[PDB]
Amino acid sequence: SIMDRSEIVARENPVITQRVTNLLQTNAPLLFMPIDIHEVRYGAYTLFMYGSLENGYKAEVRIENIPVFFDVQIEFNDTNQLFLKSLLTAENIVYERLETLTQRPVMGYREKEKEFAPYIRIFFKSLYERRKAITYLNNMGYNTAADDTTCYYRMVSRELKLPLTSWIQLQHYSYEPRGLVHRFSVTPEDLVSYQNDGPTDHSIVMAYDIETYSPVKGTVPDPNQANDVVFMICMRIFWIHSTEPLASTCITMAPCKKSSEWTTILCSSEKNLLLSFAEQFSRWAPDICTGFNDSRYDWPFIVEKSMQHGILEEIFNKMSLFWHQKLDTILKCYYVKEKRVKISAEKSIISSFLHTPGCLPIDVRNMCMQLYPKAEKTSLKAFLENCGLDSKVDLPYHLMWKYYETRDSEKIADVAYYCIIDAQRCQDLLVRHNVIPDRREVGILSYTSLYDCIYYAGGHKVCNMLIAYAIHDEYGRIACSTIARGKREHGKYPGAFVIDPVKGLEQDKPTTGLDFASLYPSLIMAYNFSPEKFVASRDEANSLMAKGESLHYVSFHFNNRLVEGWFVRHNNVPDKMGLYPKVLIDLLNKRTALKQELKKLGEKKECIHESHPGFKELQFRHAMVDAKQKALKIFMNTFYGEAGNNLSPFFLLPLAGGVTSSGQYNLKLVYNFVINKGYGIKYGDTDSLYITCPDSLYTEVTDAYLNSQKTIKHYEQLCHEKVLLSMKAMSTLCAEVNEYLRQDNGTSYLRMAYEEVLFPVCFTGKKKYYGIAHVNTPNFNTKELFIRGIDIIKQGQTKLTKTIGTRIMEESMKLRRPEDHRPPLIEIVKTVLKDAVVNMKQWNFEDFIQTDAWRPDKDNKAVQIFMSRMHARREQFSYVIVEKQVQFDIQGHKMEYVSEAKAKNLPIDILFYINNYVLGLCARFINENEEFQPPDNVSNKDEYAQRRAKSYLQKFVQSIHPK
């Protein structure tokens, strides 16, 4: 009595499914959209891809007659052909045919008449033989190309221009229906990539939730333990772009009252529950699988239970769409365990799941972690409150165990609703953060499947894009390798030019920040840092210089060894431009066009309200263009990181060394040129200069204050005039420096940009400053502050600190007359602290709702003392069995001594909280004083100043605080 997927998609979209049927009955071209890709290794090579049609039917497309091949560099003569054939046949390796061709290498520079090199291509039949042949040939060390080993669908994608993550137009096919699945058979010549923007997607995402039981209270159920039994399963299906559910299903052990919004299926044992789960999965057949915390608690538990009961084969066979399989094969290959997913350079996550063909499994928690690598809290409620979506039901877990063990119907129905909402939260997050379209656009731009775009790093994507642009060059074919060759040296790069900042607060002269617009890509474009234009020997460089070609020279010092190198320039000629400049310039042109398009679309949208019938398509267009520009940004910023990696097959130490050296040289040249003109430098870092205006420009308006009435509005109008004059001078300086760089380097690809004016300013350490913004016109009554480095963001630990720090900064940055007083950033801290110490009543019980649940209740730092105290008080509300209880703490006074939210007045000893929390932030605010510098014999400097500055401030506050 459960509707199939076909019935649902027919009921929801009548006209579209009618059109699809009419097109199907007459062998007409059709649109297809892939999700998951699977391939067969042994035997003949056939590529399987699963996906959706326009209306919602599930489709399987199988590609045959895909040629499998790889290249080698020897000669064209038949003698070497026979020698290679004998070497291959030495250990029973099958081959089909050999071909010969010509193409260009990637390493080294060759003259115009010798640019092409001869290759021999070997064709095979199964991937096993190809992999073994590549391994053996590299074992004797032959320079081979097109050497993809781990995955092969990438080569097929880049060799045919088939964006596996976008729409595919298919015609001239063979069609066979089978129940719910429509089998298509095609050939490589019958597929086209759909260049036009396509209609809306109609895939299916299913969210599942599981609730299990453990006889022993206070412990997390263990899969290895046979006492644990599952009792609650919830399934929901949604569209890829909508929140309203299409259907829901409920499976329970104990009987429950029926509900209007879902259907329930009764069971009798563990076997029945698992078989019902498999049957419902087969009936719906979803494309994407999801559920929060399914990576180490849901999937391994269910697979362990299935293995214990010995029903894994049947459930897996009903799960997937592939041929029949055996249990050992399922355990060995299709079940992944301890998979590593990388977030940042220091964070990684373990994952485990079951990969049934025809459905891609994703974990929402991992995606949220990747989107927010700096999130301090790792809870679902934290993500819900950060994303701004509606919060879930605050139902404690021990309530669910108690209500399950009470064995009543309506309460289990209520917890069923609770877990349904918990499941829906995942799809809420996925739609809110726009994960699928973003990863889809990245895959389209990178020629890679969706599974790799969601589970792997980003360097391989940039390598793949580089190879894709390399193969289809319009002046020839360029052959790029994939396996790394050469010794892996380790060391540190030179450079790191640093200029010391001028400490303190400035309110007499304003400062302005000049920035470099994408320094490293600009340098790559300007100086031709491409591997195909590299010369190593000095004699060759001298010969080419004699010939008449301009060159660029790089030299540095790596691992106590002097490294030299030469590069060939292009002097603004499209023919002689290299590969990296080509790819960067193409990306830049695409980005500029997309920016213009989105600006025009937004200008149109600002005149259109949201109640138009056609607003939905405009919103979809806006979202798509935003995703596209984001993907362009991420590749353009990750390119340099990929290029310098020591594991990349394109690595060259001279390239990275020269890039860094050129950056340092250009920074030094600009700094020296600015000094020569009479201006002053206040800060400098890699690609930014914070500079100042000379005094002689400010004289005239200054005299106005000398003979004025010296009121507040006088000083205000002096401030306005000073800001305007600073802006006027800075624009001209930026123009002049751009002209100087253009005349020096010879190309206009490198330029310096003007963003903002800051006055007054405060610099309190490296990469730490704050001030008042001024975009175009002066304003001083604004409350917004420009903050960099100092991070008053965290509020879970405390929230009074935020108010006190905001008050400190606001008091410190206000403009003052030159004749009242100039407190050197210490009297401000003193005044604010003494004000805070006195008159306690001007705070209230708002930030004092901190909680720390002692769920383990057995091993922790100090919460066990509080637990023992409350247990003794109860034995002498209880809230003792609530391990996951969010109870507020109020230290109404050096050993914990916290109190519950339910309490009498109990005056708060604010000294404990201040000395625990705010002194650290204040020290970080003031730690960079010159008085507290450490002597040279001390190894650690930051902790030195931090510790003794905090100690000084704390002890002096204690002294001034009466006791």
From TrEMBL:
Family: Belongs to the DNA polymerase type-B family.
EC number: 2.7.7.7
GO biological process terms held by the UniProt record: DNA replication; viral DNA genome replication
Record's catalysed reaction(s): DNA(n) + a 2'-deoxyribonucleoside 5'-triphosphate = DNA(n+1) + diphosphate
UniProt keywords, alphabetically: DNA replication, DNA-binding, DNA-directed DNA polymerase, Nucleotidyltransferase, Transferase, Viral DNA replication
Keyword Isomerase appears in the UniProt entry: no
Organism from which the protein derives: African swine fever virus (ASFV)
Protein name per Swiss-Prot or TrEMBL: DNA polymerase
Keyword tRNA processing: no
Sequence ranges assigned to domain DNA-directed DNA polymerase family B exonuclease in this UniProt record: 161-319
Domain DNA-directed DNA polymerase family B multifunctional: 485-919
Its biological purpose: DNA-directed DNA polymerase involved in viral DNA replication.
Molecular-function annotations in GO: DNA binding; DNA-directed DNA polymerase activity; nucleotide binding
